[PDB]
Amino acid sequence: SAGITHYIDAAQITIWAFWLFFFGLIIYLRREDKREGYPLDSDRTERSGGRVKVVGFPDLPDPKTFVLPHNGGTVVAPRVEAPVAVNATPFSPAPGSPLVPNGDPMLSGFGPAASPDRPKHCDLTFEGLPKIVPMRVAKEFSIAEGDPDPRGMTVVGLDGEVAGTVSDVWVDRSEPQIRYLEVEVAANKKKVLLPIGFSRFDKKARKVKVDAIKAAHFANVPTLSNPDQVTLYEEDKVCAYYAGGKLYATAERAGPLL
């Protein structure tokens, strides 16, 4: 008998092996996925006083340690993070309801204005010099031939009003580029950072538009504990404020449209 066709061929079983390796892969990737934000926030946890820490399937992976270079530290993941109050109040007492920011929305530090507490230290070059520093601290840097020098352009907010003028340019000493625009504010001549991401140029006019906030809001830009360098804490703090204006800076960004 030389014809007993087997119903099982290498192609079936290779498709079997694959799916098994697959499932293990998926599972694993979802585990690396819980090295942050976990366990979750329910009132399942609060109701039970915490006896239901929310982690789901799969579960959380044993911590991993990152050894920052330069006497920098050591970070772990997953970690235990201290809760932080919410600077807002429930739009409804029902769960899943959004919260309204407390007080003046741009000040709230809630919503598009919220942000975490990153180190109060500076990111560093390879050598260990403050990575992000101004061109005034980073002597070498230079505009690229054929690019308007931002230095001296007028910074202008979302409504038209002048905001200030570019007093300097902050650069990456690691990957040479403009990261932050410095702004001598008109209303008080204080110096603030302006993330490049929020800034549009109008080279033919030497203006630097900013849809984010109004010219006035530039007065409240979060500040630097040193005008010649900036910490991780301070960057988030700077940007999130402008970001808040995307939903706050006007009595209309709140939406609807209809």
Binding site: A11, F18, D33, M135, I143, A144
Partner: protein
């Protein structure tokens, strides 16, 4: 309105960077840098220096040899008419040894240039492999690239060398030509009864589509959190910021679950390596194990049936 972080609108220069320093043994670096205002319009304007060791030189060497055999051969097929060479270039190619020869080393005029170009190409790709492992060690880094390059090398090897040796015939490897190698692809599917019904080729297709899906999603994300320096992924990985937060949350609020600044790079990594690895497996079973995938799909009841509205009588059966 808002900058999109598509085009660096105002650049800055600084003296070029020779790079983090390599240990003893890792040879000097060569070439001295330049800047392209235009690469600069979209990315690091610095061009080079480059590193070249024994490895790097033996790989550039083999690789260019292989490129010459293929090319010179193509000029020969048009009679040394560089004009005609220019005219039909897309259609020119260097075909493989004929089956009549099996796996024997063939005469120059009958395929031997292909076996030599295939030989030298492979040695040069695998030398570039070693190159990236060396360049990756000099930096204390890990071999994640090398595990991927090794996967793509896997597919390559399956295509032009492994399947051929298993099938006992150099004529089964792919020929060097644009249109010729496209034709090789189509004929390959045809010869084995439509490759669409090959499970592995379906998975490789889900994974190719997935590399486009993930990189488009992630990439769009990092730009959307570029405002918070999300591109600076390393520190968002060590010291989570509102970029990594807004990032993980956009997706969380959208599709119900999410990843992290470190893990998305693993989903993406694993999805790419998977393409080539299902892909190679896919070519491995063709002829070695399965000869007609459509039939295979029928035997496993996967091929759909449609009302037979058009049909033709079989002359072979008259």
């Amino acid at each position: 309105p808002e900058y999109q972080n598509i085009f660096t609108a105002v650049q800055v220069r600084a003296p070029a960077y020779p790079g983090v320093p390599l240990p003893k043994g890792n040879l000097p670096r060569i070439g001295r840098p330049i800047f392209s205002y235009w690469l600069g319009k979209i990315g690091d304007a610095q061009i080079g220096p480059i590193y070249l060791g024994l490895t790097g030189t033996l790989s550039i060497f083999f690789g260019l040899v292989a490129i010459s055999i293929i090319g010179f051969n193509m000029l020969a097929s048009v009679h040394w008419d560089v004009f005609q060479f220019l005219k039909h270039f897309f259609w020119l190619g260097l075909e493989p040894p004929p089956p009549q020869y099996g796996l024997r080393i063939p005469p120059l005029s009958e395929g031997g240039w292909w076996l030599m170009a295939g030989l030298f190409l492979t040695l040069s790709i695998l030398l570039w492999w070693v190159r990236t492992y060396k360049r990756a060690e000099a930096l204390g880094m890990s071999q994640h690239l090398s595990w991927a390059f090794a996967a793509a090398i896997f597919f390559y090897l399956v295509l032009g060398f492994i399947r051929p040796v298993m099938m006992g015939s150099w004529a089964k490897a792919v020929p060097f030509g644009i249109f010729p190698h496209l034709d090789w692809t189509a004929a390959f599917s045809i010869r084995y009864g439509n490759l669409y019904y090959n499970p592995f080729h379906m998975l490789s297709i889900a994974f190719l589509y997935g590399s486009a899906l993930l990189f488009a999603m992630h990439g769009a994300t990092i730009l959307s959190v570029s405002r918070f320096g999300g591109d600076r992924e390393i520190d968002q990985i060590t010291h989570r910021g509102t970029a990594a937060e807004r990032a993980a949350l956009f997706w969380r609020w959208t599709m119900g679950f999410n990843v992290t600044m470190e893990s998305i790079h693993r989903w993406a990594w694993w999805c790419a390596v998977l393409t080539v690895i299902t892909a190679g497996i896919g070519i491995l079973l063709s002829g070695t194990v399965v000869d007609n995938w459509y039939l295979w799909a029928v035997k496993h009841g996967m091929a759909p049936a449609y009302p037979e509205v058009v049909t033709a009588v079989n002359p072979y059966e008259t």
